[PDB]
Nucleic acid binder design. Structure first.
Lengths: 65, 103, 435, 54, 100, 234, 100, 63
RNA sequence: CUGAACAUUGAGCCUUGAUGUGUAGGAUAGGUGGGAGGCUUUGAAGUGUGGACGCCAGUCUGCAUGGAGCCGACCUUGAAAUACCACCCUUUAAUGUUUGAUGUUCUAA
RNA sequence: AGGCGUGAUGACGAGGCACUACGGUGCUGAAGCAACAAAUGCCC
RNA sequence: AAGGGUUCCUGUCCAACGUUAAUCGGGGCAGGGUGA
RNA sequence: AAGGACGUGCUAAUCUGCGAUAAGCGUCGGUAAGGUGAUAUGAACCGUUAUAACCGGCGAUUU
RNA sequence: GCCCGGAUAGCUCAGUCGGUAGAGCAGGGGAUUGAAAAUCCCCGUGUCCUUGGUUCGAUUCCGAGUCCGGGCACCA
RNA sequence: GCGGGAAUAGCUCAGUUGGUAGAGCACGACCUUGCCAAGGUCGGGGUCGCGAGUUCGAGUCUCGUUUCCCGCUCCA
């Protein structure tokens, strides 16, 4: 059923954001009120984030029953 | 007489600093002037009003004599007084060091 | 100072960051309209904006419009702040733990790694509570999801998923762009507000009429408020008296040099909001309850106040002036800076420490806080006077300025606190031999 | 007297100028740029959505 | 640590754990429960950076500590004065002997 | 000395007596103090202004009076008895070596005119010292009418009365008898007053005729009025 | 006039800081450094003509200075007078007193 | 200095020095001494200006 | 600085009286010149007083009586000689005094 | 000189009741008379 | 009182100075303070 | 008056100079591109060749 | 110990020209008296302080020695 | 041990270039008085301490000696 299906992907998706977040990003991706690794460069990591924003819009439509 | 200006050109008669020039930042009441970049010493500076303000060993202008520097004219480094011999009602400077007759 | 901002703008590094930010805000606005499988973002966004009477203003200030005009989820930034708080307890206990945190590069990594683990446990608890609560009070929720077994299961899962996504999002942005990230969300809220207001100025245009006069006044107004808040805030009463004399000579005289000013002549934006939320809140809690059928008595008291000092505007206004004044005088508590100053050693110049130093230090803070109270009220008044001839406003009045100020001051402070350091370091390394 | 005493203190207190305020003004302009932006993309994304779901 | 402390105050003032005003009143529309808006913000602070190509700022706040040297004495206690004494000592003699 | 007898008494009782009357009144009074019937020595006491006494400032000399003395003219010669002008050009009573010297200097003689000749006068001045009241001694000038000693002794035999000075400068000279007549007296007086004037000693003080007194023996006297240059103006 | 501008030259600095000079302005009186004028009457008439303060008893006390015990020659701080002027009206909030 | 003194006039200058001393230096020196308006350059002027006016009066009875 | 009168008292010229005694000189030698002498009628002398000595037989004279004539021995010794007439000083007296002393009285310094 | 009115129906007051940040502050208040013995002091 | 002249008190600092040590003191440092 | 006492600066002790017009003031001239004496030179400011500052004559103030 | 002096017939003492020692008072006798005092006369006893020396002969000259009387340092 | 004093009549006591050397009392002879006082007269006497030196002349001057005396060694 639609609502379940998005959810399974979402949880896989999360794991991926974290993986990205630690290497380029700084191991402070969430809340850390300092910063120390992005800004310099363009990376992989921006795209995972971009995806997340985009992703949220996608989820409901699909989910919509 | 004088040889001082607050922008004076020198050819520098100070050893280890000859063949150089610089504006006269300020004229001191000590027979000294400050010529650009040649009086720099590394100065173990201790912040006062201490803030972010850097300590370190900072390059800081000292001051050398006016009689241990020599003027630059306009094509020659010669110095043998600048003439104040002309009065227009006030003494006016000119070169007689090389006799190019300009301040 | 002006000269300083301008310089940055010329150099490459800034331009890349500034570009990113305009993109970043957009990403947030887009997200907000399209719904959630769990509650339903678009429906939530509309309702909030509407009217609501008393209830809407209290909710609105604290929020800043952040996602009260651009509603999505019901968790995200709050888990990060909660988590960030637990680590602050942990730091206090153990000195060593605190030290790593303070050093910025180390400090940041620690906070997220700990926060993500914390956030997950914490979040499930919050979500369950949120999920039960939301259906009951109206009867109904969403329109991509509707109340039932299905709404509860979806709602928990969806808040958690969202919360993690946001946390990563917030981090990529901070370094890429300028201004903290937490700040950006809040900022979008200000943006969401803007079209209704804009439409009205556009209509007025120039034509040489009342409407022409008002446009010119409004343009001016926005700036003025901003300027006035700013002048006071820096405003410093700055007394430098060197302790002893310590013989003479050196400079003009070598004394033990104590230059103390920590004075802020305003009361501070976060305090201001606080006082305002609190008066509103008992009534607002009541009003919903009353309607449902529950705490009818609590509502009845709220209604009673209207026969004295009438009008919906009149009770609140009068109360708000007194309250700003009151809050400030008594206590120095919900302003951090005030507390900090007192704890560290110091002594008032000319005075011998004891009872007399304690007395004097408090007195300045008591004045200072009162001063702030006065200034906030004066900005709010100017619209109120203006409007009766001019046209009624609706986004250019009083509890909005407070909402606008807190998000900016802070966003701005952060861009400086990273940005100045960053440039200095970058410059420095290159001179050394170092990318 | 209590309000006044607070005022009486203010007039001396206000110092440590923001002759700087043109920086704040320059920042205001930068804050403005952003607003304009959220609205534009919102029309682009929204437009894609309007075809599908509107 | 300083920043976190400001965050905490903001949250506290919420007196509802942030925006959590139950739906109702007059306008309809389901109810939510909100995130945790706010900011943070900085404050004296730090900064500076003689950068700008056309600008220059300062600082604000701090302290100091000088103990220098106080030296003088004892040296500055034997030259700035003089402890001269004539040492008055009497030695009464003793006669009476018969050397005749 | 002075007697109580009537003629003596009336002058004697008066203190500062013997006052000066004109010469005629003088001589008229003088006669009547006695009865003529006996000889009596009429003297003149002519007073010279010298107060010089027993000194060589005495005036002594000798003048020839045209008449006798009051006891009848008799002569005794002070001699050396080997004289040349007193034993060989005027003679003497005897040539006594000091047989006659004694007699003069003895002070008891019945000869009136005591003739002097040298016995020493170049070493004895006009001195009155231990000389005789009756007797005498040659003095530098023995004359005053002759400035010769030789001729004086001649003069003395003719009838010269040798007169000499007193305590009050008194030149006593025997004028005559009382049995003389007024005119016979006058002539003598004049001879003696003029003699003192003519010459005097130049080894002494001067002359000048003060008081001229005239007296007879046993009675007193009274004096004749003088101008001191002439008895013929007063 | 009643007095010249040179009998209104009598104040060159107040005293408004630390012990018995903040305490004894809040609780009682007012206190100011009064040059070295050596008068009490003209200081009463100073705060009449200039300002508009009303006073009670005006108290005069000579201050003999205080040591600077590092020498060079004599040292020590210069003489001055302190006066408790004493309010009866005004109730001034520091750097106010009157002026029209 | 120059033109200042020279354009002074008896009646005028008399009332001008009262202003100088009192309520343009009187306020200043008290404020400055407590650090509440301490600007050292302002202290140097005013003082050495009010002086000038009095000079003319006892010299020649104003300009 | 400091005066007037009057009283008393030595001594100098003197003026007028009475002794002026050494030794020798019978006795009467301050002294100096005249000088062998006085009887002038209440007058010296004489008779008596005082002063001089009694040293070789004496007299002088103040002053009273007294109209009433004596004695240096009319010697002679000595440095000087006596009566008596001038007249000196002392002892002494009175005058003229000159001078030094004290006193007294007074008032004018 | 000293006693008694009055000044003073007030102050002060043993001791209690409150809170606190632990610096301290607020809250309250009984009796307050009588007799005898005193100084080198006071009347003096 | 005389006399001293800030030595008082307050916070600090300890090289020299108190017969020691000395965190302390009347020492150094600078404030505050004597009100008719 | 000589000579002092006590003040006097941007502030702080003394030194220097000067007196409540107080490290000066005016006036006339000289002079001038740099200055605001020193221990301790700082802070704030001023003037820039022609108006500061410095030097002198004269005057003012000169407790 | 240190220098000086005296040492006498009963009691008290004289005693240098060395050569045979006397004076007084006691005491006895005679003169005086009536008898006595007093006063006069005469009387002897010293082997002249011991022992040597000078001498024909020393008590009396000399040298010691005794007893007694004179004058002189315990210690600075 | 030293420095200065004297030995003169029985007794107490003068003098002295060294010329014939003295007093008062006692004593001798008288006198007043019965007789003695008191009173009154008139006499004697010296190895001049002893021996020399000086000299015509010593006691002293001079020198030796015996006896009798004072003043000093305070001062050191």
């Amino acid at each position: 059923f639609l609502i379940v299906a998005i959810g399974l992907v979402g949880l896989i998706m999360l794991q991926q954001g974290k993986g990205a977040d630690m290497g380029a990003s700084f191991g402070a991706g969430a809340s850390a009120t300092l910063f120390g690794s992005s800004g310099s460069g363009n990376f992989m990591t921006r795209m995972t984030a971009l995806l997340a924003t985009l992703f949220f819009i996608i989820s409901l439509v699909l989910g919509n029953i | 007489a004088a040889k001082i200006r607050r922008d004076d050109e020198v050819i520098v008669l100070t050893g280890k600093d000859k063949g150089k020039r610089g504006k006269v930042k300020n004229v001191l009441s000590s027979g000294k002037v400050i010529v650009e970049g040649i009086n720099l010493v590394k100065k173990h500076q201790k912040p006062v009003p201490a803030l972010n303000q850097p300590g370190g060993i900072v390059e800081k202008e000292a001051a050398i004599q006016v009689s241990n520097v020599a003027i630059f004219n306009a094509a020659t480094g010669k110095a043998d007084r600048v003439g104040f011999r002309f009065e227009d009602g006030k003494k006016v400077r000119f070169f007689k060091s090389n006799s190019e007759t300009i301040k | 100072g002006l000269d300083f901002q301008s310089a940055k703008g010329g150099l490459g590094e800034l331009k890349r960051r500034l570009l990113f930010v305009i993109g970043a805000l957009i990403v947030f606005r887009i997200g907000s309209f399209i719904p959630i499988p769990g509650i339903d973002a678009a429906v939530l966004a509309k309702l909030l904006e509407q009217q609501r009477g008393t209830i809407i203003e209290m909710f609105n200030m604290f929020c800043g419009g952040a996602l009260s005009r651009a509603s999505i989820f019901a968790l995200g930034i709050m888990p990060y702040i909660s988590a960030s708080i637990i680590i602050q307890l942990l730091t206090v206990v153990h000195p060593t733990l605190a030290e790593i945190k303070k050093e910025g590069e180390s400090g940041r990594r620690k906070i997220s790694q700990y926060t993500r683990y914390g956030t997950l446990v914490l979040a499930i608890f919050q979500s369950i509570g949120i999920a039960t609560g939301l259906p009951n009070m109206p009867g109904m929720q969403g329109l991509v999801i509707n109340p039932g077994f299905a709404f509860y299961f979806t709602a928990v899962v969806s808040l958690v998923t969202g919360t993690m996504f946001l946390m990563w999002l917030g981090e990529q942005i901070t370094e890429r762009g300028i201004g903290n990230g937490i700040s950006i969300i809040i900022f979008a809220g200000i943006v969401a507000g803007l079209p209704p207001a804009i439409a009205h100025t556009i209509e007025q245009a120039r034509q040489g009429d009342l409407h022409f006069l008002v446009l010119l006044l409004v343009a001016v107004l926005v700036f003025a408020v901003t300027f006035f808040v700013v002048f006071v805030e820096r405003g410093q009463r700055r007394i430098v008296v060197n302790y002893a004399k310590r013989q003479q000579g050196r400079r003009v005289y070598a004394a033990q040099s104590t230059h103390l000013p920590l004075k802020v002549n305003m009361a501070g934006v976060i305090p201001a909001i606080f006082a305002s939320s609190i008066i509103l809140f008992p009534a607002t809690i009541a009003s919903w309850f009353g309607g449902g059928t529950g705490w009818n008595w609590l509502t009845t008291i709220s209604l009673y106040l209207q026969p004295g000092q009438p009008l919906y505007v009149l009770l609140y206004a009068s109360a708000i002036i007194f309250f700003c004044f009151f809050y400030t005088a008594l206590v120095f508590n919900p302003r951090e800076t005030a507390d900090n100053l007192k704890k560290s050693g110091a002594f008032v110049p000319g005075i011998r420490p004891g009872e007399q130093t304690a007395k004097y230090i408090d007195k300045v803070m008591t004045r200072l806080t009162l001063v702030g109270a006065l200034y906030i009220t004066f900005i709010c008044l100017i619209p109120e006077f203006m409007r009766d001839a001019m046209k009624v406003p609706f986004y250019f009045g009083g509890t909005s300025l407070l909402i606008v100020v807190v998000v900016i001051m802070d966003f701005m402070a952060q861009v400086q606190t990273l940005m100045m350091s960053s440039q200095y370091e970058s410059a420095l390394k290159k001179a050394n031999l170092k990318g | 007297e209590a309000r006044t005493e607070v005022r009486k203190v203010i007039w001396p207190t206000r110092q440590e100028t923001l002759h700087t305020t043109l920086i704040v003004a320059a920042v205001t302009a930068v804050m403005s740029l952003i607003l304009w932006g959220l609205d534009g993309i919102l029309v682009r994304l929204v437009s894609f959505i309007t075809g599908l779901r509107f | 640590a300083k920043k976190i402390w400001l965050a905490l105050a903001g949250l506290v003032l919420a007196f509802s754990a942030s925006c959590a005003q139950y739906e109702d009143g007059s306008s309809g529309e389901l109810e939510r429960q909100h995130t945790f808006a706010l900011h943070q913000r900085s404050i004296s602070g730090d900064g500076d950076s003689p950068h700008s190509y056309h600008s220059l700022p300062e600082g604000v706040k701090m302290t100091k500590y000088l103990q220098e040297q106080k030296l003088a004495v004892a040296a500055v206690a034997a030259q700035a004065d003089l402890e001269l004494f004539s040492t008055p000592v009497w030695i009464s003699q003793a006669q009476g002997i018969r050397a005749g | 000395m002075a007697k109580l007898t009537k003629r003596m008494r009336v002058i004697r009782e008066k203190v500062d007596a013997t006052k000066q009357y004109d010469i005629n009144e003088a001589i008229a009074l003088l006669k009547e103090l006695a009865t003529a019937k006996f000889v009596e020595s009429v003297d003149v006491a002519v007073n010279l202004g010298i107060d010089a006494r027993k000194s060589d400032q005495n005036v002594r000399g000798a003048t020839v009076l045209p008449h006798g003395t009051g006891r009848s003219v008799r002569v005794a010669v002070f001699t050396q008895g080997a004289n040349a002008e007193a034993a060989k050009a005027a003679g003497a009573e005897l040539v006594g070596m000091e047989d006659l010297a004694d007699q003069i200097k003895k002070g008891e003689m019945n000869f009136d005119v005591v003739i002097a000749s040298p016995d020493a006068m170049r070493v004895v001045g006009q001195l009155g010292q231990v000389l005789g009241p009756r007797g005498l001694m040659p003095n530098p000038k023995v004359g005053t009418v002759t400035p010769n000693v030789a001729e004086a002794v001649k003069n003395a035999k003719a009838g010269q009365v040798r007169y000499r000075n007193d305590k009050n400068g008194i030149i006593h000279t025997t004028i005559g008898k009382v049995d003389f007549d007024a005119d016979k007296l006058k002539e003598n007086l004049e001879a003696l007053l003029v003699a003192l004037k003519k010459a005097k000693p130049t080894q002494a003080k001067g002359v000048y005729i003060k008081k001229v007194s005239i007296s007879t023996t046993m009675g007193a006297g009274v004096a004749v009025d003088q101008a001191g240059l002439s008895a013929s103006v007063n | 006039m009643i007095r010249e501008e040179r009998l209104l030259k009598v104040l060159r600095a107040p005293h408004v800081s630390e012990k018995a000079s903040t305490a004894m302005e809040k609780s009682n009186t007012i206190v100011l450094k009064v040059a070295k004028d050596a008068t009490k009457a003209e200081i009463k008439a100073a705060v009449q003509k200039l300002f508009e303060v009303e006073v009670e008893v005006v108290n005069t006390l000579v201050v003999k200075g205080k040591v600077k015990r590092h020498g060079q020659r004599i040292g020590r701080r210069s003489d001055w007078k302190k006066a408790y002027v004493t309010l009866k009206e005004g109730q001034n909030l520091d750097f106010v007193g009157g002026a029209e | 200095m120059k033109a200042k003194e020279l354009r002074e006039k008896s009646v005028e200058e008399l009332n001008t020095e009262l202003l100088n001393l009192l309520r343009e230096q009187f306020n200043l020196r008290m404020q400055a001494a407590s650090g509440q308006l301490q600007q050292s350059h302002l202290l140097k002027q005013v003082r050495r200006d009010v002086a000038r006016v009095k000079t003319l009066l006892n010299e020649k009875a104003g300009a």
